[PDB]
Amino acid sequence: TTQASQNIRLNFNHPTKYLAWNFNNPTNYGQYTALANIPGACSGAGTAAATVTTPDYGNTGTYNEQLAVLDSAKIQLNGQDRFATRKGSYFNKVQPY
Amino acid sequence: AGGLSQLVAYGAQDVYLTGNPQITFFKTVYRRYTNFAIESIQQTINGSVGFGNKVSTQISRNGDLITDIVVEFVLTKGGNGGTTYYPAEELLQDVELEIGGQRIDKHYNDWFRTYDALFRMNDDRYNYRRMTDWVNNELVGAQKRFYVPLIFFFNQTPGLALPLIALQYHEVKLYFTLASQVQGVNYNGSSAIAGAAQPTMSVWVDYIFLDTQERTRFAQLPHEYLIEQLQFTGSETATPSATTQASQNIRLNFNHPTKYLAWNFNNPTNYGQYTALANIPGACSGAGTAAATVTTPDYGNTGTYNEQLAVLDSAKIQLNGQDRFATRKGSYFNKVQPYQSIGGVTPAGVYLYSFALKPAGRQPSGTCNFSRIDNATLSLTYKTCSIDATSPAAVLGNTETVTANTATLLTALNIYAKNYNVLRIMSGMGGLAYA
Amino acid sequence: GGLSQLVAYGAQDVYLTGNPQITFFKTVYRRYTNFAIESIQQTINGSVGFGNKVSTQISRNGDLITDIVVEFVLTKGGNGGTTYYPAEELLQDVELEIGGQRIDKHYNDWFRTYDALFRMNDDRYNYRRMTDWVNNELVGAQKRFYVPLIFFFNQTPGLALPLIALQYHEVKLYFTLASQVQGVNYNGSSAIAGAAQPTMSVWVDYIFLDTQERTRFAQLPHEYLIEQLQFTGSETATPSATTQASQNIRLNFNHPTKYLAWNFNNPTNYGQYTALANIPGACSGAGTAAATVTTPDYGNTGTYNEQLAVLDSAKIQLNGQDRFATRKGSYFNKVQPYQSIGGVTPAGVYLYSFALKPAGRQPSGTCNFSRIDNATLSLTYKTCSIDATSPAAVLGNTETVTANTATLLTALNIYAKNYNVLRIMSGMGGLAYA
Amino acid sequence: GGLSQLVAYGAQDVYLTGNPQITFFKTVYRRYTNFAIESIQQTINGSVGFGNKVSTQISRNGDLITDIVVEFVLTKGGNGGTTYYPAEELLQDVELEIGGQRIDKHYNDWFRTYDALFRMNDDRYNYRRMTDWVNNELVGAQKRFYVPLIFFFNQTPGLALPLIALQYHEVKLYFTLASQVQGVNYNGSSAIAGAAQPTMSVWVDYIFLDTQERTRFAQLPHEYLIEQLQFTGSETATPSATTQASQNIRLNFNHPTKYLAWNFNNPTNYGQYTALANIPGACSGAGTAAATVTTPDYGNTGTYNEQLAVLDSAKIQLNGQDRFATRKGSYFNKVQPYQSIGGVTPAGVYLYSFALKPAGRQPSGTCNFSRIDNATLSLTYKTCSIDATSPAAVLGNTETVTANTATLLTALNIYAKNYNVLRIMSGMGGLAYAN
Amino acid sequence: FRDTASIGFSDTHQDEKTLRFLKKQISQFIKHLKEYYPNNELTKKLVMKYSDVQLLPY
């Protein structure tokens, strides 16, 4: 029903090269996205037995961003935006590009 | 007899009122002032304009100083009267103020609503609504021009007019985000309104033209303008239930000397909804009759003073682990705080906590410097959501700690902090003293 | 508790609290002069009645004068809803004369325009309670109305007129009473048989000064910076249902002007600045079968529904050059008052300020028309295409149009408020500039 | 544009902008002291309940005190329309004492009169929200009500009581709770079975000062110009259908007085300053067959319908001589407030000012009753001949008459608000003048 | 060509540092209690935190 938000204080020290992060389901190693009844996105995806409670483990990770959770993010230092807010896809595809 | 009989009734208790008199009331000497003139000038809007678009303007150097800024919009009703709520305010999703390439401030449509809920009043508040909504029972297709004054510090007092004249090499820009959807204009609840028109936008800046002696000083001298800024974060609201009073510790990521904090709980589905929906007159779509639903508000009557429908039970603010003040009821923040600090009336669901004697004024009157506070926290307790919102007997006839079952829809929390900073201007350039 | 905030202090606070200059916790009150204020009745010269001209001379009872309230007693000639600020309608005008010189003058329409723009909230409500019937009174009800005057000295003690310093000069008020007052002695064009003539009384609130203050006023020269009203009536470029009427009026105005104000009206009905319509409150009987879009709901003559207003847009041109870009009628109705006054202005009433705060006493920017050859007010009117008898036609329509009944607003009233100096010396007064 | 206004400068501009003294476009804010504010709960001595007398000593937690809010929790003993400002009615009176010396005292009726005269617009509404039920709440409903106090130090920071400078003296508040509150524990004269006793708590807002200012307050002597309320209740020369009653009340007031205020009222109906009538809102059941003009519509007790007021005219004499010409009761109800306050006063409530602006804190002319041997309030009453049950008689009548039910307004409350001086010296204090 | 003598990045008068700046003020003057020290030395504290420009020949 709503866009959730979260402000996470970063208890980091030292001259950091980069930050990295992921969202996941603790039950399933490597699951960083939502499950879905599309090929590779869930156990049994594409058929009658498909369930979106369990992943296709061999295909746990995916490039299908629709299933990504983060809408947007920014990093602040002492309350100051370190950069303009960018979409989650900016941090997923552009940064590493 | 007559007034003279009072005049001569003089004794020792009058000495501290009229002895060795210093002032009178019958001889006002007006101060001579620098010559100036004021003009409202249209700015150019860059970027595609319409719902969901982001557009911007650069304020031209037509005059020397700028103050009041009004964004004009033309909107057409997508439904009948009662289906909109401050839609031009909803439309202007946000406005960002950039001077010299840096953010000075930023406002949000919700802030405009919260700000108004707390700081405007009486006929000013009514006139304001007349400038952003349809308040004369207009019908579908009606077209009106709306005005949305900006609420940045320089838009509130000439005393903070931005010296474009002293900013010779720095530009002043406003970035405006338009909402993708506006209730009763292009959407009705979750549904789109087929055939809805796109808005027309125009930005007007009121310029001050100074005479030559004043213009010379501004262009040459350094200046330090005490300005206000709005800090804002959105948070998840611990969701209350019929079975419990949820509680929550919200970390407040604020900085700078803060005049006050302000907040509200809301349902993002419906702009301006800070309270639970109910089948009592004005509290829901169709409220008061058989057709009433407590899934949709009476949009034209979204705001209410009915505390019973507010979600917050009580709250306290902690600073670095120490209680700032004893826990007070939500009704304290909703009615007492603004009684004492503002003097207007605050709608249910909207709360204020001041660190200042007079947060509504420009003159500093006490601030909380959150830059010296590692862990500022807003600690909230919510009401029990057990009231059957569709039954007035339960809605109107109930206890202090219990609210509507529909209050669990108010899952978003908006916390604002209004603070001070200094806008330093020298040799045509400027920026804020503290990041 | 509070200590946790005091300790939260650093460099960012220095600009707010370092080397502190003030506190809020200790007020020094300023010892003032010794004075008293008395409300004294003036004698009205001439004969009080509808349509008559009367006058009063202000008696030398006190040393200074401020507030003036004109009392009127009227009886309802019909039921609730038939009157609209009738005491205001009755006081057709008032002229202020000092030493035989015309200093200022107000008109019933100015009192209405002024109220529409500058009074507000409960000041405005209490104000209506003193000039109208607002508790659903019925025919025959009798009420005393109190109409305050709004001359410069009637608004602030700061400009109290020092009658004491005017020993040689009379101060007079000349009043014109309206020939007709709606819902009192006439109902639209019809006379109301049996209506009573008004009872009138003028009250002046006089300040009594003690010896030192009184002596200074009596002997020293003074220069009072005061405000004056300028006013001319014009024929409106009457709106039409076929097109957009337009008009350019050279304003015969002078002096440093704090603001211009104007309205369009139907001279038939006091306070009618908008079109009549079959929407609730917009006409007599509006909303039902009996509705007539030829007569207003007098008790609801004024409205905030801009659809019924006739100004599409306007600008002021000075000596051939635009003073500002053309803005819509709703700018002048809603924004100007938002920015400059902080009140809420009824549809059909417009304001354009040259001042930052025109509602105050202190000058805050003026336009001196004594140095402008061609001050022209340019007005563009809406097209009166809406069938006023059909509420849907009115309530669902566009920005550039209005009611067909809007063409009845044939009179144009343009006002200007300026500053001048009332010089007082050696027992006499008069204005520095004409 | 604006430039043509700046350029066309003439002789008449000299008196406005020649040799200019000020500008409007650059405000320098005054640097203030370092302070913080906190709302701290006090302990109440004695049992709180209907008709009880309780008190509290203000805790020495901060250095200065200002705002004080009494919290109550009340429940509805009937449906909407049965209560009228019940938290205000409940707090029968409050007495302020320093070092054992009376400083001041307010009454529930005074709070009602004060509100009627000095609050306004949304301040007044927000206030009503803090003392009554205004969203049509039903029987059994529970609400927390905030009653801000109106003592001199509760109105401005400028008079913050220097508890810090009172090292040897206690400061106390004595609160009398009403034996009955309409719509809470009684309905007219009838007790409501099962009615709950109020919960009560007193909160004091303290100011925490930094080192330099605390030191000065603790060590220096101080003289604070304060306001006081004088009050005496009187029997009304009750009017009748057969006569214009009149009355001469010797006014037992002292000290430089800013203003007098008074009202006539029904001894058993809180806030009723006017006669009852069968017109909408003017009585229980007004407008229908069940209408009665012996009982008010309690939720609508207040009105602006002067016809139901009882004062025909009045004058105040000083030493037996007229102070001003006799004026109609409607003058004292509508004009005096217009001139001196700027709000709207309810019918039946009257004001006479001796001051230009009594609503403020700065003296602006006073009448010193300690130097007036025989001050008298002379009243003339309206004739109670209107049949209150007939709108034709009530709404269509003459200036000099009122309702037959106006004879129920037998109580007269006359108040005076004056100045005095509160001296604090070497840790102790009291007032300069007794009378 | 075009005449813009600034950089426009808010990097001149911005005290964009952490809240280690007041700690630097404490170790910069003397007196670790800065709740009464800026209240005493106002101008002496103000001039200690201002700009320095390194011009260009162009």
Quote the distance between the C-alpha of residue C88 and its chain's center. Answer: 10
Q: Does C16 touch chain E (CB under 8 A)?
A: no
Touch test E–A: 3 Cβ pairs or more under 8 Å: yes
Q: Does C27 touch chain D (CB under 8 A)?
A: yes
- Could you say which residues from 229 to 268 on chain B have a Cβ atom under 8 Å away from some Cβ of chain D? none
CB atoms closer than 10 angstroms to residue C325: 13
CB atoms closer than 10 angstroms to residue C67: 24
CA distance C121 to D343: 8
Radius of gyration, CA atoms only, chain C: 24
CB atoms closer than 10 angstroms to residue D207: 29
CB contact under 8 A, C41 and D120: no
CB atoms closer than 10 angstroms to residue C271: 28
CB atoms closer than 10 angstroms to residue E40: 12
CA distance B328 to B331: 8
DSSP-derived secondary structure for C249-299? EE----SEEEEEEEEEE-TTSTT--S---SSTTSSBTTTSTT-BTTS--GG
CA distance B110 to B268: 10
Pick C9's closest partner by Cβ from E35, E43, E46: E35
CA distance D342 to D331: 14
Query: Alpha carbon of A82 to those of A75, A79, D29: distances in Å?
Result: 6, 9, 32
Q: Does C6 touch chain E (CB under 8 A)?
A: yes
Q: Measured between beta carbons, which residues in chain B are less than 8 angstroms from residue C17?
A: 364
- Specify the 3-state DSSP secondary structure of A58: helix
CB contact under 8 A, B31 and D17: no
Touch test E–D: 3 Cβ pairs or more under 8 Å: yes
Q: What are phi and psi of B241, to 5 degrees?
A: -145, 170
Q: Does B412 touch chain A (CB under 8 A)?
A: yes
Q: Measured between beta carbons, which residues in chain E are less than 8 angstroms from residue D31?
A: 42
Residue-wise over B352-365: b if at least 16 C-beta within 10 A, else e?
Answer: bbbbbbbbbebbbb
Contact call for residues D268 and D189 (beta carbons, < 8 A): yes
**Residue A31 C-alpha, separation from nearest chain B C-alpha, in angstroms:** 24
Q: Which two tokens stand for residue D277?
A: 């009538």
CA distance C413 to C254: 17
Strand partners, B387: B404
Sequence-distant (6+) residues with CB within 8 A of D267 are D410, D411
Sequence-distant (6+) residues with CB within 8 A of B90 are B109, B179, B182, B183, B271, B272
Q: What are phi and psi of C423, to 5 degrees?
A: -90, 135
Beta strands in C32-117 (DSSP E): 35-42, 44-46, 53-57, 64-75, 91-98, 101-107
- As a residue count, chain D comes to 435
CA distance C291 to C282: 9
Beta strands in B279-395 (DSSP E): 312-319, 322-323, 328-329, 350-354, 368-369, 376-382, 384-387
Q: What is the DSSP letter of B293?
A: B
Q: Which experimental approach was used here?
A: cryo-EM
- As a residue count, chain A comes to 97
Which amino acid type is present at position D226? Answer: I
**Residue E23 C-alpha, separation from nearest chain C C-alpha, in angstroms:** 9
Q: What are phi and psi of C329, to 5 degrees?
A: -55, -35
Unique residue bearing structure tokens 């003439």: D10
Burial of C289 (0-12, 13-18, 19+ CB in 10 A): exposed
Burial of B28 (0-12, 13-18, 19+ CB in 10 A): middle
CA distance D176 to D195: 19
Unique residue bearing structure tokens 């016809």: D307
Q: Which two tokens stand for residue D113?
A: 């009169």
Q: Does B340 touch chain C (CB under 8 A)?
A: no
Sequence-distant (6+) residues with CB within 8 A of A8 are none
Cα dihedral sign, C212-C218-C224-C227: positive
CA distance B92 to B188: 18
CB contact under 8 A, E38 and C20: no
Contact call for residues B344 and D122 (beta carbons, < 8 A): yes
Q: Which two tokens stand for residue B281?
A: 């007159």
Query: Alpha carbon of B413 to those of A4, B235, B349, B382: distances in Å?
Result: 10, 5, 10, 12
Q: Measured between beta carbons, which residues in chain E are less than 8 angstroms from residue A78?
A: 17-19
Identify how many contiguous H helices and E strands chain D contains and give both numbers: 9, 24
CA atoms within 13 A on the CB side of D17: 25
**Residue B304 C-alpha, separation from nearest chain C C-alpha, in angstroms:** 20
Angle between helices B122-132 and D121-131 (to 10 degrees): 100
Touch test A–C: 3 Cβ pairs or more under 8 Å: no
Q: Measured between beta carbons, which residues in chain C are less than 8 angstroms from residue E35?
A: 6-7, 9
**Residue E11 C-alpha, separation from nearest chain C C-alpha, in angstroms:** 18
Q: Does B424 touch chain E (CB under 8 A)?
A: yes
Q: Comparing C-alpha atoms, which of D367, D341, D334, D173 is closest to residue D254?
A: D367
Q: Measured between beta carbons, which residues in chain B are less than 8 angstroms from residue C335?
A: 70, 131, 147, 149
CB contact under 8 A, B235 and A5: yes
Resolution in A: 3.5
CA distance B173 to C158: 43
CA distance B374 to C28: 39
Q: Measured between beta carbons, which residues in chain B are less than 8 angstroms from residue E32?
A: none
Q: Which two tokens stand for residue D193?
A: 């079975």
Touch test E–C: 3 Cβ pairs or more under 8 Å: yes
- Could you say which residues from 311 to 330 on chain D have a Cβ atom under 8 Å away from some Cβ of chain B? 318-319, 321-324
CB contact under 8 A, D210 and E39: yes
Quote the distance between the C-alpha of residue C411 and its chain's center. Answer: 17
Sequence-distant (6+) residues with CB within 8 A of B154 are B66, B67, B160, B161, B162, B227
Q: Does C21 touch chain E (CB under 8 A)?
A: no
Q: Does D31 touch chain E (CB under 8 A)?
A: yes
CA atoms within 13 A on the CB side of D81: 10
Q: What are phi and psi of D281, to 5 degrees?
A: 80, -15
> Mutation test of the interface with chain E: which of A12, A77, A78, choosing the one with the most E Cβ atoms within 10 A?
A78
CA distance D47 to D161: 27
CA atoms within 13 A on the CB side of C190: 9
- As a residue count, chain C comes to 434
Kindly list the partner chains of chain E, i.e. chains with 3 or more CB atom pairs below 8 Å.
A, B, C, D
Q: What are phi and psi of C330, to 5 degrees?
A: -70, -20
Unique residue bearing structure tokens 């409940």: D90
- Give one word for A88, left, alpha or beta, with left for phi > 0 and alpha for psi -120 to 50: alpha
CA distance D72 to D147: 8
Q: Which two tokens stand for residue C166?
A: 């005017």
Q: Does C215 touch chain D (CB under 8 A)?
A: no
CA distance D255 to D228: 9
Q: Comparing C-alpha atoms, which of D270, D263, D336, D274 is closest to residue D303?
A: D274
Strand partners, B317: B378
Residues B150/B152/B154/B156 CA torsion (nearest 10 deg): 70
Q: Comparing C-alpha atoms, which of D358, D122, D396 is closest to residue C125?
A: D122
Q: Comparing C-alpha atoms, which of B99, B133, B103 is closest to residue B116?
A: B133
CA atoms within 13 A on the CB side of D310: 35
- Specify the 3-state DSSP secondary structure of C321: strand
Q: Does E19 touch chain C (CB under 8 A)?
A: yes
Residues B97/B99/B102/B106 CA torsion (nearest 10 deg): -10
CA distance B377 to B356: 18
Beta strands in C76-221 (DSSP E): 91-98, 101-107, 142-148, 171-177, 186-187, 190-191, 199-209
**Residue E37 C-alpha, separation from nearest chain D C-alpha, in angstroms:** 11
**Residue C161 C-alpha, separation from nearest chain B C-alpha, in angstroms:** 9
CA distance D34 to C7: 10
Residues C287/C291/C297/C303 CA torsion (nearest 10 deg): 50
Cα dihedral sign, B390-B391-B397-B402: negative
Q: Measured between beta carbons, which residues in chain E are less than 8 angstroms from residue D210?
A: 35-36, 39
Nearest CA in chain C to D206: C2
CA distance C61 to C42: 10
Query: Alpha carbon of E49 to those of B355, D234, E14, E43: distances in Å?
Result: 27, 68, 11, 10
Which amino acid type is present at position D171? Answer: V
CA distance B26 to B24: 6
CA distance C318 to D374: 64
CA distance C150 to C228: 10
Q: What is the DSSP letter of E28?
A: H
Q: Comparing C-alpha atoms, which of D154, D204, D177 is closest to residue D74?
A: D177
CB contact under 8 A, B255 and A79: yes
Q: Which two tokens stand for residue C305?
A: 């529904």
CB atoms closer than 10 angstroms to residue C411: 18
Nearest-5° angle of CA D235, CA D411, CA C71? 100
Contact call for residues D64 and D218 (beta carbons, < 8 A): no
Q: Which two tokens stand for residue B434?
A: 């503290």
Q: Where are the alpha helices (DSSP H) in D336-382?
A: 336-340
Pick B22's closest partner by Cβ from C30, C206, C398: C30
Contact call for residues D62 and D208 (beta carbons, < 8 A): yes
